[PDB]
Paper text:
The full-length SlpX_ac shows differences in structure and domain arrangement compared to the SlpA architecture. The middle domain of SlpX, SlpX_ac_II, exhibits a SlpA_I-like domain fold and an additional repeat of the SlpA motif. The four residues observed in the vicinity of phosphates are conserved with the proposed binding motif of YxY….KxxN. These residues are not conserved in the third SlpA-motif, which is present in SlpX_ac_II. However, SlpX_ac_II contains an additional 3rd SlpA motif and an additional loop region, allowing for increased protein flexibility to incorporate into the assembled SlpA-SlpX S-layer. In summary, the atomic structures of Lactobacillus S-layer proteins, SlpA and SlpX, along with the observed differences in their domain organization, enabled us to generate a self-assembly model for SlpA, the main SLP. This model aligns with prior studies and suggests a domain-swapping mechanism that enables the integration of SlpX into the S-layer.
S-layer proteins (SLPs) are self-assembling, crystalline proteins coating the cell surfaces of many prokaryotes. We determined the atomic resolution structures of all functional domains (I-III from N- to C-termini) present in the three S-layer proteins SlpA_ac, SlpX_ac, and SlpA_amy. The Lactobacillus S-layers are anchored to the cell wall through interaction with teichoic acids (TA), either lipoteichoic acid (LTA) or wall teichoic acid (WTA).
Numbering used by the authors: 189 to 298, 301 to 362
Write the structure that this text describes.
Amino acid sequence: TTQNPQINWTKGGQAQSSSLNGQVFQVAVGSNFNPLNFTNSNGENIIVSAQQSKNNTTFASIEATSNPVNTSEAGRYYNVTLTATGNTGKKTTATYTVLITSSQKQTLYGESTISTYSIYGNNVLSNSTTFKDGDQVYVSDQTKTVGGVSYSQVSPKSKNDANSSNIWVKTS
């Protein structure tokens, strides 16, 4: 009830209205995982924090009470339990699940420099933005073809960003 600490979380900087308890997140094989601040497979930053109560916005202490997460192997899942403790010792827990997936990123090779383009309707314009050989990016599932050339939309930030970055490379 209302007097217990409240756990808050943001995904991609946006406050979330659904409770952290019960969430299922994807985390990439090989990643460093902190259960209070981590990046999901699609590049969205997830930050968990707490306040004293529903109505009291003062900092409340929060820590992982159970964190067996191991990112070494894809196809495994782990439950994380977080405990928030108010200044008079009331407690709230949330348990979320982490699925270890393979990387959703792709490596750009191109020649050392990869040129980018912006697309509006059926028009391809040059973009000054360049990637270096070896740079890793998320890639939109939706490609676009202009003049029989295929282009992929990309972002180094997130899969979501890649769908609207209007930074395109030639699909290889």
